[PDB]
Amino acid sequence: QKDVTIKSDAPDTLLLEKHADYIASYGSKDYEYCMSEYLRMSGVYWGLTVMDLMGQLHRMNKEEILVFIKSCQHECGGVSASIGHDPHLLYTLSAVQILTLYDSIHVINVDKVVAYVQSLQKEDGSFAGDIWGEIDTRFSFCAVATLALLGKLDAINVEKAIEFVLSCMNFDGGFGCRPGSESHAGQIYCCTGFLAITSQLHQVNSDLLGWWLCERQLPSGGLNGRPEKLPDVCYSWWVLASLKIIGRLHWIDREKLRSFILACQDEETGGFADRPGDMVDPFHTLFGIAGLSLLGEEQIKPVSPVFCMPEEVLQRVNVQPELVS
Amino acid sequence: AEAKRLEREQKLKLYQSATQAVFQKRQAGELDESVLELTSQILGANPDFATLWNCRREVLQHLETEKSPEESAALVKAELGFLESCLRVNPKSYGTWHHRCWLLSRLPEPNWARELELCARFLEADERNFHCWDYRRFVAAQAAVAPAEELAFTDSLITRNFSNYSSWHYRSCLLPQLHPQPRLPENVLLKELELVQNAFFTDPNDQSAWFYHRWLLGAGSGRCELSVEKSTVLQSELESCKELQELEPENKWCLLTIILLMRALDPLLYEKETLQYFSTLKAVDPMRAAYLDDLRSKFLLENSVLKMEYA
Numbered sequence: 001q002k003d004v005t006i007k008s009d010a011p012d013t014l015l016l017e018k019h020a021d022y023i024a025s026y027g028s029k030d031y032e033y034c035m036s037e038y039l040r041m042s043g044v045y046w047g048l049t050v051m052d053l054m055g056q057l058h059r060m061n062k063e064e065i066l067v068f069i070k071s072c073q074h075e076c077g078g079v080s081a082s083i084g085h086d087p088h089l090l091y092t093l094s095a096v097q098i099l100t101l102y103d104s105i106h107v108i109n110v111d112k113v114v115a116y117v118q119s120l121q122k123e124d125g126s127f128a129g130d131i132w133g134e135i136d137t138r139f140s141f142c143a144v145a146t147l148a149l150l151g152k153l154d155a156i157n158v159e160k161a162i163e164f165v166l167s168c169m170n171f172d173g174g175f176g177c178r179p180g181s182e183s184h185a186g187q188i189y190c191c192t193g194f195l196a197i198t199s200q201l202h203q204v205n206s207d208l209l210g211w212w213l214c215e216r217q218l219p220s221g222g223l224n225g226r227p228e229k230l231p232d233v234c235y236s237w238w239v240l241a242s243l244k245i246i247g248r249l250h251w252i253d254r255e256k257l258r259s260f261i262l263a264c265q266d267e268e269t270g271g272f273a274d275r276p277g278d279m280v281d282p283f284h285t286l287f288g289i290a291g292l293s294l295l296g297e298e299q300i301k302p303v304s305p306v307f308c309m310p311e312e313v314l315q316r317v318n319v320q321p322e323l324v325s
Numbered sequence: 326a327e328a329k330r331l332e333r334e335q336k337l338k339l340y341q342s343a344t345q346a347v348f349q350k351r352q353a354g355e356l357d358e359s360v361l362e363l364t365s366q367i368l369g370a371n372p373d374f375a376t377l378w379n380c381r382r383e384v385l386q387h388l389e390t391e392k393s394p395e396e397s398a399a400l401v402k403a404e405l406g407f408l409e410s411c412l413r414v415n416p417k418s419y420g421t422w423h424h425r426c427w428l429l430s431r432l433p434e435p436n437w438a439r440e441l442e443l444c445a446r447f448l449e450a451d452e453r454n455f456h457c458w459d460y461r462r463f464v465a466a467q468a469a470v471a472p473a474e475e476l477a478f479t480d481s482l483i484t485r486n487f488s489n490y491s492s493w494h495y496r497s498c499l500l501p502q503l504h505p506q507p508r509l510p511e512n513v514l515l516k517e518l519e520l521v522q523n524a525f526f527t528d529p530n531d532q533s534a535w536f537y538h539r540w541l542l543g544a545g546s547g548r549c550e551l552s553v554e555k556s557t558v559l560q561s562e563l564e565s566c567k568e569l570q571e572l573e574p575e576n577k578w579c580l581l582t583i584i585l586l587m588r589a590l591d592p593l594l595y596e597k598e599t600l601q602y603f604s605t606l607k608a609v610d611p612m613r614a615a616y617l618d619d620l621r622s623k624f625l626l627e628n629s630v631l632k633m634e635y636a
């Protein structure tokens with residue numbers, strides 16, 4: 001019932017040129033900009049990844065970004081979102097993803113990153129985001145995705161990490177933040193990504209979870225993150241990537257979702273917003289473009305459903321987890 | 326346009342200089358109340374500035390060692406008030422809820438009953454706020470609240486109104502705790518089927534009841550070694566869904582559930598009807614046509630295996 005109504009004049013064409021122009025010019029130089037500096041490293045990752053998927057990575061500033069990244073690695077080995085901010089697993093992953101896109105991993109101290117990640121694992125197998133101890137399956141994913149890209153998944157207690165993630169699996173086939181937490185598409189992406197990386201997708205009930213995920217699709221074509229919520233273009237990534245991992249991507253109406261995603265574009269400014277007619281941002285621009293790639297858009301590079309990076313990049317580093325057939 | 330633009334240009338400049346001041350003080354090892362004053366000004370509008378919650382914790386830790394017992398107790402009560410004011414403005418910031426957990430976990434005794442009430446309050450505003458449900462489960466475990474009490478909380482909720490998935494999900498975790506095991510016992514399962522059947526007949530829209538019912542259908546041990554009572558209940562549910570199908574012919578949930586009940590009852594005896602219902606369902610829910618074809622294919626193979634088990 002809760003849903004958007006797409007306008008008859010909503011964009012129905014993919015506007016790559018405008019998106020590339022928008023991201024290439026993002027951060028020049030602004031209130032919400034300023035105000036989101038606490039996530040800058042992830043913001044940089046979102047921008048670089050979407051540009052690379054569109055074949056426009058060259059238009060970004062590699063040299064500047066590599067100096068920024070090195071400046072954000074702390075003595076503990078962890079990486080912060082920005083200079084002067086505190087290290088965290090979120091921005092450690094984002095940094096490693098960026099360096100992988102640029103084939104510049106040894107810009108940072110890899111041994112120390114591995115030690116940092118290792119140190120955040122708890123006795124039950126879970127991971128804290130940082131020294132202050134917040135536990136979330138987001139961080140289980142961040143830890144194993146970071147390690148996988150570095151070729152160091154053996155640094156953590158994998159069986160215990162698996163046990164923890166499976167203890168977050170719910171009655172409906174999905175996954176939440178922590179044991180007992182309600183299922184949410186964002187957490188399902190993290191957990192199915194985790195299970196892909198650790199070769200445990202046989203433990204997912206693909207038919208049950210797949211059904212729960214395809215029921216995210218509302219009459220508008222758009223996807224929400226759990227029942228009775230509004231759709232959001234970023235669920236085009238969270239839901240679709242999960243469905244792809246578990247081999248059930250065809251359970252979505254591809255055409256209606258494509259139409260919804262394109263409607264979220266801003267025809268004047270470029271970029272995508274969470275829903276049609278709202279304010280655009282790099283976060284939603286990445287997830288709209290990546291969702292379209294998962295749906296098979298000709299003009300966009302194929303994207304890894306696990307790592308949200310171009311598949312050609314992961315092929316290069318030889319980390320391509322097997323998905324459910 | 327201009328006055329609104331100029332206003333946030335003023336906000337920024339002050340947010341920027343306060344942020345600069347905090348970082349300058351921290352580098353200088355000045356872990357003091359002013360710090361606390363500066364960060365309150367920033368975190369008010371921007372609670373997702375995680376590093377600043379870290380700064381507050383470092384200060385509170387430092388001041389613990391330097392201040393008297395009751396100066397320290399005063400500082401924690403002020404922090405609780407600050408946190409609640411922050412949650413009012415943005416009740417979904419991970420950092421804010423975690424800072425509250427960090428704080429309460431340190432206290433040797435905290436008032437857990439008060440925290441459960443805070444949860445009740447935020448849940449009556451947004452009954453789907455998962456941060457708050459996560460915090461409630463934290464408080465419940467800390468206070469050692471028994472599953473039965475939390476089960477009573479969910480009953481009341483599901484009654485008040487719809488909106489609803491978060492409360493059924495919680496029930497799904499509580500029930501196995503009350504009836505623990507290395508499945509639900511049938512007496513429990515039957516009571517749950519009655520409760521959920523009430524819900525989705527009271528509001529056929531009510532997608533959380535249908536999801537939970539699908540789970541209950543599979544959580545039975547372990548049938549068809551169906552008891553006469555469960556056979557009769559399921560058959561009754563089947564006829565009630567058919568009645569609802571008449572009242573609400575655009576309702577896909579009731580159609581899917583009719584298929585699932587027939588499967589639960591006797592897949593081979595209901596093969597004809599099952600196939601008929603698949604066609605009808607696909608017409609009313611075309612976006613799910615591929616899922617429905619795969620589910621039907623699965624059921625057709627199950628049926629071949631049952632037939633070939635003849636004997």
Ligand SMILES: CC(C)=CCC/C(C)=C/CC/C(C)=C/CC/C(C)=C/COP(=O)(O)OP(=O)(O)O
Pocket residue numbers: 090138141142185186187189190225229232234238307308417455
């Ligand atoms: C490599 C990538 C892409 C990610 C790294 C791993 C992370 C950090 C994943 C985040 C997953 C997550 C928690 C997504 C949720 C985003 C979202 C739309 C949240 C909103 O949730 P609610 O609080 O339910 O708000 P709504 O009810 O309004 O949807």
Ligand SMILES: [Ca+2]
Pocket residue numbers: 057058059060061062
């Ligand atoms: Ca360039």
Ligand SMILES: [Zn+2]
Pocket residue numbers: 232233234235274284
């Ligand atoms: Zn979003």
